[PDB]
Amino acid sequence: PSSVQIGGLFIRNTDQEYTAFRLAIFLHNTSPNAAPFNLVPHVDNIETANSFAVTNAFCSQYSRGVFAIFGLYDKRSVHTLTSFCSALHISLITPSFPTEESQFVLQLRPSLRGALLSLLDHYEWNCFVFLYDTDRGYSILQAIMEKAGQNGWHVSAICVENFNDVSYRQLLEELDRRQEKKFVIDCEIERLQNILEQIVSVGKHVKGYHYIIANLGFKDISLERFIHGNVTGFQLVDFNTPMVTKLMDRWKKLDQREYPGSETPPKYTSALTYDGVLVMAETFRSLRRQKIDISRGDCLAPAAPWGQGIDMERTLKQVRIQGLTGNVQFDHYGRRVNYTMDVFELKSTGPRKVGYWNDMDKLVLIQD
Amino acid sequence: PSSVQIGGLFIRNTDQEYTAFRLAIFLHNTSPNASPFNLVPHVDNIETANSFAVTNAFCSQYSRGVFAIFGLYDKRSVHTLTSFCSALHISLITPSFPTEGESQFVLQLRPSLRGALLSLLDHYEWNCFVFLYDTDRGYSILQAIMEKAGQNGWHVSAICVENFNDVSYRQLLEELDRRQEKKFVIDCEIERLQNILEQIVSVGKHVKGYHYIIANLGFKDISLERFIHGGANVTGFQLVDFNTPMVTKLMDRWKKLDQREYPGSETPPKYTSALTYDGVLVMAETFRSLRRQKIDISRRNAGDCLANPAAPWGQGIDMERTLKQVRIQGLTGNVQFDHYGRRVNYTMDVFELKSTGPRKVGYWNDMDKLVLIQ
Amino acid sequence: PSSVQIGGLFIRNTDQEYTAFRLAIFLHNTSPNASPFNLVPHVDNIETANSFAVTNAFCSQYSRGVFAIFGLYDKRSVHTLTSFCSALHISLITPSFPTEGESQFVLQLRPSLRGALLSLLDHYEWNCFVFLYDTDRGYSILQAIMEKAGQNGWHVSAICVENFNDVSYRQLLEELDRRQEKKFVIDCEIERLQNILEQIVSVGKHVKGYHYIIANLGFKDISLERFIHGGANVTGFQLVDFNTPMVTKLMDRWKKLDQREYPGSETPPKYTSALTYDGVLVMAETFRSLRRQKIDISRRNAGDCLANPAAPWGQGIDMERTLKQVRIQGLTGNVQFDHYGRRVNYTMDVFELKSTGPRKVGYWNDMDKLVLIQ
Amino acid sequence: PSSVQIGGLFIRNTDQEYTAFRLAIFLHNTSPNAAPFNLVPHVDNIETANSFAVTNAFCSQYSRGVFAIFGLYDKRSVHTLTSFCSALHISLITPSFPTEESQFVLQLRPSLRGALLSLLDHYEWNCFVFLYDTDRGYSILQAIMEKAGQNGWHVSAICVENFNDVSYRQLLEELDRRQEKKFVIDCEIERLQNILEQIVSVGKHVKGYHYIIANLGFKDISLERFIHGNVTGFQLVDFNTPMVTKLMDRWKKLDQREYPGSETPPKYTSALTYDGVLVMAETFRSLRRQKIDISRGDCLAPAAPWGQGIDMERTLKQVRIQGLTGNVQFDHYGRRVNYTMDVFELKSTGPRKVGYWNDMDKLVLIQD
Fold first, then answer.
1. How many CA atoms lie within 13 A of C47 on its CB side?
2. Helices and strands, counts by H and E, chain D
3. Where would I find glycosylation on this chain (chains A, D)?
4. Do the two chains B and C touch, given a threshold of 8 Å on CB pairs and at least 3 pairs?
5. In angstroms, what separates the C-alpha of C168 from chain B's closest C-alpha?
6. Do C77 and D77 make contact, defined as CB atoms within 8 angstroms?
């Protein structure tokens, strides 16, 4: 097997992720090293991102026999993509939000719930607001509410879906009336820019107000205005490693005509997509090493089980490499294990690393 | 067109709903000729209730040439079913929880409950209470409760009761009793609701001084004899009125039914049974309206539910418009939808438990909010 | 004499006892030849359980040439049955309540409970408590409790629960709660005991701070899951030991029984079932003893139970003496009677209810009174 | 019908009752007035008074077809006599203790429970002792205990069955140690004499100690020692009526050879037996007036019902005469209704009537 077909499912507002996925495949195509299989993606980008489009693209990919699909989903499509992959015995590698038991799924994105809870405990926060959206699911929100109930917190959860400039202004005025000082922001990247620009315009960009940015791309979003005017966040990928250095000095190639979004440093989702490509490449090497000839139907047949799918799924779930997100390893549930992320607090000189959070030592802070 | 094909979807633990569907369609079929058509149902009762099984069944229904589909869904299968129905212009009638956040080609028989519950909480002047909930029916109630609490500064302790056993409920109740919190709001599945009520009786939290609010439309569908004797304050919402000619006739027919042929007939129909009965009535009236509007219906189509590109039904827009343009009287009252698909101009009774039993204290309507009897 | 005729009397709601009687006699009949006789029972199961029906059945048994009679009686039929048995020298074996106040030709399988209950009350240092009782099993316990209270100056409030419905129990519990009395002693029929326990759970009196004492020998024969979860202190007396080879073998045979042929086998045997099983064992051993003593038995007689003048059986005195001179091991322990007919040298376990469940706290015996585990 | 056979069942220590029953029959034999039926009793006195003797005598009487039996029973024989009479459809007239629903039974003795409770309420007794026996049943005892529980009384119930002189002495010493001042005595007549003589010997016969004698024969027991040394009691029959005057001036005939016990004024049980004879005579007149020819088996047949027994039983239950115990009338349950009894309190001059108790006005006391 030298031309291995794989499937790719992307949704709207994922230009950078698609570019990173293409770049990872291209590097895998030009990496001789030690079977020389070349990954050809049958990528099917969908704009609507509704359940019907997900089903249509998934069945079309299944008709081509891709043995695996690298997909991205939202709250409205997770229950469709995961269900089809679990029933049709095709492994599903997704860098999107993890799903709170599951099969045939590899969630590359680490669960942000644990890190956020540890940070809140360390900062001894008792009353705060929870400006949030539902795009990534009700995983952080439920944990915050449950933790507040078990700890007697005065939390004010505020949904900011379908908000316009008037809505943000009204919300800001209400917060000023309540004199809320501590904020937790959990929204999509574009919504983060909208919230941050509205806050800096209305006049709450000072260091007295504490803002926790609940995402893994803290350095991926520009916060230059806040230095002039206490902001904490989580960073997933370390920029001081040899492998990310190789990615950067290969990323400087500004072929924006063929690689849109390459003008800026890759976002955390882009790093996760690159890491997923490495996981698929490494596990294909493992299957080839085990001398398992992977080969082969249509959707809505009754289930069309894949005999080789179970062993292939297990091989994915037992991979352990050193990727952009560190020790990439999965447990038997498909989640991420043995991972760490740095905690950056903004200072006068810029972002500064205070500590890092991992699943075995919780949060550990640098002290003298 | 004497025969009309109607799709039907049923999930697990919905036996009573299926019998109500069969009973409603039988009454319409065996009815005096109010001058004219028959409904043939293609029904699929899947137990797993996963998205893949729902998609397979919906494709089978689409291949079977159904004009409308009566489906049940949970948080798992809500998105796939609604999106598939809207994409192919095949309308759906559901008694499940609403999917607020815009929609098309879907008619929610179940009315919104957030307004009534919020009105009740404002009337009771509650500040701190334990909100026990699950995520089987979405998160609309949970989001609304917390948004109201944040705007009003309520210290609401929300606890999810998913995947808890009897020991877990006992430990949770003991911890809450140690925290000295008296007010509770329960919004769970009917099976989980029975389990929590049994655990409350076992612990001994059904005495005077404890207030429980049951957030569903089946307050009279459950047993509270232990709570009646204990004397704890219980408030609930009942949608089905038992003092109307229509419910009386249906109950008379309900008691005279074969238990083996109609499982669940040994007990009074629940609010979901009334809701699904109303849904069949809505479909019948809309087909009459299509006949009156001189709009002929035909499938014209095959079963390529995944035809590329999509081939939406040409008469779906008119069918959806007619479905939303029907005002009828049923077990739940004035069944009348707006242009969105939700229920509007609906009324529900509010029952407070006393020693004599469940006595209505007032009603709630979309216009006057909560009006209590004084 | 291969065949031995034995009389049997059963009152209403004693199905389990009858099956235990049949099971015990079947095991003796189908047993290895421990070197020799069979027991044929003449059984009468009257439902009214009045004195006239008992007299008719006893005359039929006497006309049927039975040497011993296994009878059940209540306060209504205790005097007629005991007097008839003593007058004609036809001995009786009973598991019912004792008839203290002298007796002859009667063997009480059920041991006296007043000693154990009085010892428990003295240990608990109780002063004021509510004694709920009925009069189905005589008045010996009631008289003893009040005599002890008078000699010790206890303010015992005794209430009879005869001919009360569920509303009556609820009203009585509410009145007692208003009077602020926490300690209760329940001595009722097993059916009435279940009803009172259910009412206690419904009212909500099964929480910490309430102490209940159940005065019977079937503490493990009833369900207290609600009381286990509530945490109220419950003390009871268990006569049957479940950690002996004999009870283990009998339980193994009990589970492998036909439910239709042996009603009540779906549940573990109650203390009365163990008592009646022991009674059949006592009769078997005594017949062996008569065979060993070279005392031939024969009815010699007709059925003129009302023969004037009375014609008592000539071998009745020796039979009664041999019955009282037998020490055996059975489900209730060392079954051994004195010259009066009551049980002596008997032990019963004392169980206190905790979160883990019913855990034995000590035992009670006729010699050392109450000995608790420390 | 001129020679009507009836049955008579008497127990040990009932010589006076048997004499009164014989005297009443004799007067009925010599009372022409206005069918001239003469009552012939097949009396079967039993000494053992156990259940076997009761059954034997009852069956022998049934063999003679007596249509009714005038019986006396104790705690050990009530459940046998009543059961046979209810099942065999023969009316049972008994002057013994009433039974707390029943059929074919006429209890001539009024229920003493109501009068005792009313007297205790009037005297405002809170703590007392209850020297009692079980011969007449647990009817008064249960009521006293239940009333005490509902009123919070400090009652000390003391059984005095099988007590010898040492037992009474020990009981008296214990009472002195407890310093109990108020006594309620409910025992058989012979036990009353034993208790009273022991009390007067030990030295508690003074007026300071209050003794309530729970019986209907207060004047039938000599209390002369207490006048020299507060004793209340109930009297059922009034000695100041024309009919009791006739009974007295006929009772002075001292034919003790044929009428034992006639040397003393009749006891309350004797008056009840005399009244029962009148009830049977009056109801036979009613049956004869209704032109119902009463006629007719063996016991232990299966039930041998008597068709005329039901109407005869109802006629007994609807009789209303003026006898020694006043307005003799029975309800549909066989108990006594529309009856009254005087309450006598001992004074220096002797017994004095304070008031009277009836079932409609409870207790009413004479005051100026």
1. 0
2. 11, 16
3. 29, 33, 230, 338
4. yes
5. 12
6. no
Which helix H or strand E contains B181, and what residues bound it? none
Task: Name the amino acid, one letter, at B174.
Answer: E
CA D65 remoteness from chain centre: 26
Q: How close is the nearest chain D Cα to the Cα of C36, in Å?
A: 36
Q: How far apart are CA B166 and CA C123, in angstroms?
A: 36
Check CB contact under 8 Å for D79 and C308: no
Quick one: how far is CA A26 from the chain centroid?
Answer: 22
The runs of H, that is alpha helices, within B204-270 are: 225-230, 245-255
Q: Are B34 and B27 in contact (CB under 8 A)?
A: no
The CA-CA-CA angle for residues D78, D81, D85, to 5°, reads 135
The whole-angstrom distance between B173's CA and the closest CA on chain C is: 11
Q: Which amino acid is at D118?
A: S
Cα distance between residue A336 and residue A327, in whole Å: 9
- B→C interface, C-beta within 8 Å: 170, 201-204, 206-207, 225-226, 229-230
Do residues A355 and A363 make contact, with C-beta atoms less than 8 angstroms apart? yes
Q: Which residue of B has its CA nearest to A129?
A: B150
| Interchain pair C201, B203: CB under 8 A | no
- Euclidean distance between the first and final Cα of chain D, in Å? 55
What is d(CA D69, CA D62) in angstroms, rounded to the nearest whole number? 9
B327 forms beta bridges with B336
Q: Give the count of beta carbons closer than 10 Å to the beta carbon of residue B30.
A: 8
Residues of C in contact with D79 (CB under 8 A): 51, 75-77, 79-80
| Contact predicate A214/A112, CB 8 Å | yes
Contact state of B146 with A157 under an 8 Å Cβ cutoff = yes
Contact B107, B94 (CB under 8 A): yes
All residues of chain A having their beta carbon less than 8 Å from the beta carbon of residue B56 are 300, 302
C206 three-class SS: coil
- The answer for residues whose C-beta is within 8 angstroms of residue D188's C-beta and 6 or more apart is D133, D135, D136
Cβ-based interface (< 8 Å): residues of A facing B: 50-52, 55-56, 59-60, 76-77, 79-80, 82-84, 86-88, 129, 134, 138, 142, 145-146, 148-149, 152, 154-159, 174, 178, 299-300, 302
- Show residues of chain C in contact with D86, CB under 8 Å: 52
Q: Give the one of B202, B207, B226 whose C-beta lies nearest to C229's C-beta.
A: B202
d(CA D164, CA D194): 9
Domains of chain D: 3-110+240-337 (3.40.50.2300), 112-235+341-365 (3.40.50.2300)
Which residue type is seen at D315? T
Distance CA(C102)–CA(C270), nearest Å, equals: 28
Say which residue the tokens 């009459």 belong to.
B288
Query: Quick check: C316 and C310 in contact, CB under 8 A?
Result: no
- Amino acid sitting at position B366: D
CA distance B58 to B53: 9
Enumerate the residues of chain B whose CB falls inside 8 A of the CB of residue C225.
202
Residue C360 C-beta-side C-alpha neighbours within 13 Å: 15
Check: CB of residue C16 under 8 Å from CB of residue C250. Answer: no
- Please give the structure tokens belonging to residue A288: 């080839």
**Integer Cα distance of C341 and C322 in angstroms:** 11
Q: Is the peptide bond before B309 cis (omega within 30 degrees of 0)?
A: yes
Count of residues in chain A? 368
Chains B and A touch (3+ CB pairs under 8 A): yes
**Residues on chain B touching C226 (C-beta within 8 angstroms):** 201-202
Rounded-to-integer distance, Cα B326 and Cα B307, Å = 32
Experimental method: cryo-EM
Measuring CA to CA, which residue among D44, D51, D48 is closest to residue D76? D51
